[PDB]
Write a protein that binds this ligand. Structure first.
Ligand SMILES: *[C@H]1O[C@H](CO)[C@@H](O[C@H]2O[C@H](CO)[C@@H](O[C@@H]3O[C@H](CO)[C@@H](O)[C@H](O)[C@@H]3O)[C@H](O)[C@H]2NC(C)=O)[C@H](O[C@@H]2O[C@@H](C)[C@@H](O)[C@@H](O)[C@@H]2O)[C@H]1NC(C)=O
Ligand SMILES: *[C@H]1O[C@H](CO)[C@@H](O[C@H]2O[C@H](CO)[C@@H](O[C@@H]3O[C@H](CO)[C@@H](O)[C@H](O)[C@@H]3O)[C@H](O)[C@H]2NC(C)=O)[C@H](O[C@H]2O[C@@H](C)[C@@H](O)[C@@H](O)[C@@H]2O)[C@H]1NC(C)=O
Ligand SMILES: *[C@@H]1O[C@H](CO)[C@@H](O[C@@H]2O[C@H](CO)[C@@H](O)[C@H](O)[C@H]2NC(C)=O)[C@H](O[C@@H]2O[C@@H](C)[C@@H](O)[C@@H](O)[C@@H]2O)[C@H]1NC(C)=O
Ligand SMILES: *[C@@H]1O[C@H](CO)[C@@H](O[C@@H]2O[C@H](CO)[C@@H](O)[C@H](O)[C@H]2NC(C)=O)[C@H](O[C@H]2O[C@@H](C)[C@@H](O)[C@@H](O)[C@@H]2O)[C@H]1NC(C)=O
Ligand SMILES: *[C@@H]1O[C@H](CO)[C@@H](O[C@@H]2O[C@H](CO)[C@@H](O)[C@H](O)[C@H]2NC(C)=O)[C@H](O)[C@H]1NC(C)=O
Ligand SMILES: *[C@@H]1O[C@H](CO)[C@@H](O)[C@H](O[C@H]2O[C@@H](C)[C@@H](O)[C@@H](O)[C@@H]2O)[C@H]1NC(C)=O
Ligand SMILES: *[C@@H]1O[C@H](CO)[C@@H](O)[C@H](O[C@H]2O[C@@H](C)[C@@H](O)[C@@H](O)[C@@H]2O)[C@H]1NC(C)=O
Ligand SMILES: *[C@@H]1O[C@H](CO)[C@@H](O)[C@H](O)[C@H]1NC(C)=O
Ligand SMILES: [Fe+3]
Ligand SMILES: [Fe+3]
Ligand SMILES: [Mn+2]
Ligand SMILES: [Mn+2]
Lengths: 424, 426
């Protein structure tokens, strides 16, 4: 309630159409493949594993000669479900700020796409990031995506806050709905990388049907550039793109002191260089600050361990999803507590980041309407409406954030904020 | 912090001696194998995997007819280390409260041990649990264990709070020190089950030497009865023994709402029956209450999510380690906070368990001496001294806890508390 089977787009929806041709490459998507940006991971799925299905042809537009690469293939099973042949190809050492064309398939199944590598990492290098979370595959989900595509701000990459397909809401977590989501999202992710964050809907824990190990479907379908970041797990990693250093954290993985993620995270903080990448961005599914009734305080555990660091290294902004609505905080912190002093009230803090909740992509569960009352002072803006966001970096000191509602024009900003870098 | 290579017992120490005979079964240890208690998991390691090395012969003291079982074998690698053949045999459906003999090996390598299954689960069934945490393999570690063995209270099983071998403190986490620890602890774990709790020293995360996946050594050496508990992971599970229902949690695994462990834990709480097993015990490595300087507030994250439940289901007592010293709290809680009300002060709460910190088994890192000041009211007793503890269940309403320091006689109690069950005496 709402029932996924009643609100998600129909199986026959155009957006779920299978590309024609024998063994057509489908569910095509890419993501950054290296730490610097001249890398990419291209993913595509094929119903059969026959000669040719595992090859990518790519080439810069202003350089005729085309190179070919082979992917690594995998398949997985989940209850009575079996995947097709999933290919993942990691291409490195490309050129910065250059358009590339790549194609999959052969005969009349051949498909061509393109993408643009980001400019070399630098302090004043501008870049426009799209912001989406908890999209799923409902009719609202389609609207949200449509609006992002038409947004005059022209996003070059999407920072995704978690909860991709919501297929776990179907009987037996029907993995066929992961495939549909793959076809649906392809029109975007096939052209610009989506930087993944794992949400609780990617856990896919189902003892009832004998599936006790989490993230099996997600981990097999959406690889991450964790190794290049120094992480031995795909759920947590970091990349550098343009003037930003992005750290993606995992809400449902262990994160207390001494845990692998914690050790990786602290080391990563020390690798950050604000002189090269001014904008320090963090992604986590569950918000550390949320004043909505839904999932209220669920992020308290992580806030206890990580907030102190967010503030010490001066993260500029933190993006989260999970709560199906929108919210933006004031720069605040609650890191003075030691039990005895009883100091447990969030206070204005210019060394703290702005906290964003954008889990309103439109998944089947619907909007999270009820809010705590009255509005806490740490909250600057909160509205329950589907939409997407934009983080527009202009230079080392300015970046413009904005929220776009589906009721409004793709370019209309219902809320926005000009951020001043915390370091410059 | 002290150098492990300078304080841990020497490689040639008697306590590390390899049993004689061809392919001698070594590093023998057992733990409960089922949910009820009539189960056991026997583990032993053999340098070679030849016919016979994978068989256990076991029988009742009363019987003369001995049974035989085959184990499941595994080996693992860690950096430039390779394990021998590790065997794990899960024997089920034994008889309650009966002594059993079992033997491994052949020829003059043959070795015999014994253990005693617990009595059938019941409200007034008495039982004595030993308490140890962060023991490691130093000379103090040996003393601690010796004292437990001589303790007139006669513990029948050991609840272990985490951080077993501390071999990760040696160069490259030298897994050879896991083997030594296995021989050292054997004199006890081979006769009475140790109920494992995973500590940060079992994480064995070492990117520097290309080991990114945690718990590899621990998970391969010390199996857990998680499946019989409904858990798909060895780091978290529950068992019933005598009058107690024990829930073992994992501090370094995900534990927030919606996580596998969290879902397992909440379901497990609903399976608890205080009319069958009065004593609800919880084990976690990192203490939710600790007033020592070391690791101060490290357990705050878990307290935020789990404390509310500990109080609602009235856990009787919670045992932890991690802090190398001893501490016992008053029955308190801090579950009223909602941000806005600013209610963040621990307050006296008779519905809350007593929190115990016994990570003073004696590992190489030494004692955690500095304490926060002055002593917070939620703390009833705190002392930095090596030792072990005893949880003596007498009946559905009374259970006696006591702390034993290595400076004192195995039986001397430097601290103690008579607990009143929260369900039948509170
Ligand atoms: C693994 O097992 C699944 C068990 O749920 C199965 O789901 C389907 O199971 C049956 C078999 O097709 C479907 O059909 C109904 O079955 C009942 C049996 O009592 C019968 O009386 C009805 O007349 C009706 O035919 C179920 O509808 C369905 N489960 C549900 C409710 O979603 C999976 O197989 C499936 O079979 C068909 C339903 C296909 O259309 C797919 O849904 C699927 O293939 C099976 N795994 C797979 C291959 O998905
Ligand atoms: C189960 O739980 C308690 C564990 O020992 C047990 O102890 C209490 O009872 C003991 C006597 O039965 C008492 O000690 C005795 O004191 C007399 C007095 O002179 C002496 O002769 C004996 O040699 C013993 O020393 C313990 O002090 C007492 N424990 C405390 C301090 O709480 C419970 O005993 C209860 O049993 C009742 C039937 C009744 O005797 C109660 O008064 C007693 O507390 C025991 N409970 C049950 C169900 O038997
Ligand atoms: C694993 O790598 C270690 C070094 O990275 C090896 O240990 C080194 O062994 C040298 C001679 O064997 C010695 O001079 C070095 O000081 C020593 N360094 C260390 C880690 O202390 C190790 O080889 C083992 O060394 C010890 C542990 C011996 O007892 C034997 O177990 C081995 O010789 C390497 N493990 C391998 C490949 O067996
Ligand atoms: C919880 O555990 C107790 C102890 O095993 C169960 O009690 C049963 O019924 C009486 C109640 O006092 C008790 O004296 C018996 O020793 C015990 N007998 C059994 C095993 O049935 C208790 O009840 C269970 O059995 C009966 C009473 C049934 O109606 C229902 O209450 C339950 O199945 C156990 N309750 C549970 C399973 O949650
Ligand atoms: C999802 O929204 C898109 C808009 O981006 C819809 O795309 C239209 O698709 C039809 C074919 O079905 C094309 O002829 C139009 O040109 C597309 N319009 C746009 C604006 O691109 C799509 O139909 C929607 N899908 C569903 C199932 O509602
Ligand atoms: C942060 O990025 C700067 C631009 O790329 C770079 O200049 C900084 O390095 C500075 O200190 C050292 C490393 C020196 O070699 C020189 O590159 C600069 O003065 C860099 N910060 C660091 C320490 O890596
Ligand atoms: C960084 O981008 C900002 C957003 O477009 C832009 O306003 C900043 O320029 C401003 O500089 C200051 C000195 C102000 O007086 C005026 O000149 C501009 O608005 C720009 N910062 C840079 C690169 O100077
Ligand atoms: C450990 O203690 C035992 C007796 O408890 C003793 O025999 C042995 O020598 C001790 N080991 C060492 C080397 O400390
Ligand atoms: Fe969601
Ligand atoms: Fe320890
Ligand atoms: Mn979510
Ligand atoms: Mn520890």
């Amino acid at each position: 309630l709402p029932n996924a089977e009643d609100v998600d787009m129909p199986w026959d929806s155009d957006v779920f159409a299978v590309p024609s041709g024998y063994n057509a490459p489908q569910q095509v998507h890419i993501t950054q493949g290296d730490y610097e940006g001249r890398g990419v991971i291209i993913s595509w799925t094929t119903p059969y594993d026959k000669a040719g299905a595992n090859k990518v042809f790519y080439w810069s537009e202003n350089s005729k000669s085309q190179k070919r690469a082979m992917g690594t293939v995998v398949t997985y099973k989940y209850y009575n479900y079996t995947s097709a042949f999933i290919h993942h190809c990691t291409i490195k050492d490309l050129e910065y700020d250059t358009k590339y064309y790549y194609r999959l398939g052969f005969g009349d199944a051949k498909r061509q796409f393109w993408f643009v590598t980001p400019p070399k990492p630098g302090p004043d290098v501008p870049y426009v990031f799209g912001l989406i979370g908890d999209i799923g595959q409902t009719h609202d989900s389609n609207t949200t995506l449509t609006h992002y595509e038409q947004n005059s701000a022209k996003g070059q990459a999407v920072l995704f806050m978690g909860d991709l397909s919501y297929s776990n809401r179907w009987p037996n977590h029907d993995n066929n709905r992961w495939d549909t989501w793959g076809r649906f999202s392809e029109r975007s992710v096939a052209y610009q990388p989506w930087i993944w964050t794992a949400g609780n809907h990617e856990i896919d824990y189902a003892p009832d049907i004998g599936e006790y190990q989490p993230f099996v479907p997600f981990t097999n379908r959406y690889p991450t550039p964790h190794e290049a970041s120094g992480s031995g797990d795909p759920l947590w990693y970091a990349i550098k793109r343009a003037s930003a250093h992005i750290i993606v954290l995992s809400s449902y993985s262990g994160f207390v002191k001494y845990s692998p993620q914690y050790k990786w995270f602290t080391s990563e903080l020390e690798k950050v260089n604000r002189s090269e990448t001014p904008w320090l961005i963090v992604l986590v599914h569950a918000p550390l600050y949320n004043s909505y009734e839904a999932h209220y305080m669920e992020g308290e555990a992580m806030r206890a361990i990580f907030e102190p660091y967010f503030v010490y290294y001066k993260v500029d902004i933190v993006f989260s999803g999970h709560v199906h609505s929108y919210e933006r905080s004031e720069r605040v912190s609650n890191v003075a507590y030691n039990i005895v002093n009883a100091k447990c009230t969030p206070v204005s803090d210019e060394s703290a980041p702005v906290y964003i909740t954008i889990g309103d992509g439109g998944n089947s569960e619907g909007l999270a309407s009820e809010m705590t009352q009255p509005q806490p002072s740490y909250s600057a803006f909160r509205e329950a409406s589907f939409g997407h966001g934009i983080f527009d970096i202009k230079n080392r000191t300015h970046a413009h954030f904005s929220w776009h509602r589906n009721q409004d024009g793709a370019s209309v900003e219902a809320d926005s904020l000009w951020l001043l870098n915390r370091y410059w």
